[PDB]
Amino acid sequence: SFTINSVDMKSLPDWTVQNGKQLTLQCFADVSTTSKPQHQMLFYKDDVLFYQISSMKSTESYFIPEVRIYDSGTYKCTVIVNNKEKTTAEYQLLVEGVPSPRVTLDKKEAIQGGIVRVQCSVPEEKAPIHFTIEKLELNEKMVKLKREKNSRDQNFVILEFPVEEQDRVLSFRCQARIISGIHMQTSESTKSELVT
Amino acid sequence: SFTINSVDMKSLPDWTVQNGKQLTLQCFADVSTTSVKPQHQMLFYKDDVLFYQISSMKSTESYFIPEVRIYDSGTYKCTVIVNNKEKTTAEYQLLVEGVPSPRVTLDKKEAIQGGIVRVQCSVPEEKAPIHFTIEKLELNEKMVKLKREKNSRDQNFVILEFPVEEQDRVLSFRCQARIISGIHMQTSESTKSELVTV
DSSP states (O other): OEEEEEEEOOEESOSEEETTSOEEEEEEEEEEEOOOOOEEEEEEETTEEEEEEEESSSEEEEEESSOOGGGOEEEEEEEEBTTBOOBOOOEEEEEEOOOOOEEEESOSEEOSSOEEEEEEEOTTSOSOEEEEEEEEETTTTEEEEEEEEEESSOSEEEEEEEOOTTOSEEEEEEEEEEESSSEEEOOOOEEEEEEO | OEEEEEEEOOEESOSEEETTSOEEEEEEEEEEEOOOOOOEEEEEEETTEEEEEEEESSSEEEEEESSOOGGGOEEEEEEEEETTBOOBOOOEEEEEEOOOOOEEEESOSEEETTOEEEEEEEOTTSOSOEEEEEEEEETTTOSOOEEEEEEESSOSEEEEEEEOOSSOSEEEEEEEEEEESSSEEEOOOEEEEEEEEO
């Protein structure tokens, strides 16, 4: 006969992981037998099934090449043998850090009084993302203007910016934030362009 | 100077699809411009949640689902960006039809009187929520000896224990699964045979 002794869920490299790395989720099962069993394993994230495998081996794995904060959450894995169950404790996977964001400008040469639509997207992540956008000024070395913006439905923003008669050479720099249980920030990003 | 004329979102073969088949979602954009081929950024959403992101130079981009499942069914919209101008498709309602035949599993191949038989019925290609029906059937009798209904909010399978009567010695169980969408879908049967001793 059989015995589901106990069940684990290891996380390689850890239950906390730097954004961008690869991550592996394991489901271990200790099984006692009197001469060899097939397992069925179900991986849940937040009690929603996302992977299913039936194998002869006691450790089963799930590979994430590129961890993202959207992957962060509550993980449990259930193992069935000969229609007997047992369920791992809950495991909280924590993803840290935000990739540098992508800034984009409709113009690279702009006129005075006019406008310049500036996009800032974190393409490798999903909403909700908070942005901070500084309008920087080169011939003066001073931040003219800052915009905070919260992006509920999207992972990007397009802001209109006015060309004040005040200068001719300027760039915009951006920085994004996302949550994992506490809060995560990026490095900056910029692109240059000029005014008449 | 660019102008996004319009954007659509076609579905191959259709916005209604049989469970199990391959499906292609396209995001098209009509672009008029006075210039220089433009760069596109397209965002595929499901239920107003993003699932695919791609930047291309051609106007049509695709997303392939090799085996559609009802869990993939939902509201699909796609918004495309060119030169930091937006436009978002209408919403599209994709509908998936049919449930795969379920998979029945028995802890015993031989059971003794009065004892139990744990019966699993799983639909592994689909996710919760699933309604199951498990009948204990009889070869020498062909009448339903016993039925168990069960709804599974959390799981894509059920394990019901069944009693072995003394009335019989060889019996099989048959199962059929249901999932609802506002419209509900049924499966075919599944069975596996096994017997009893004194």
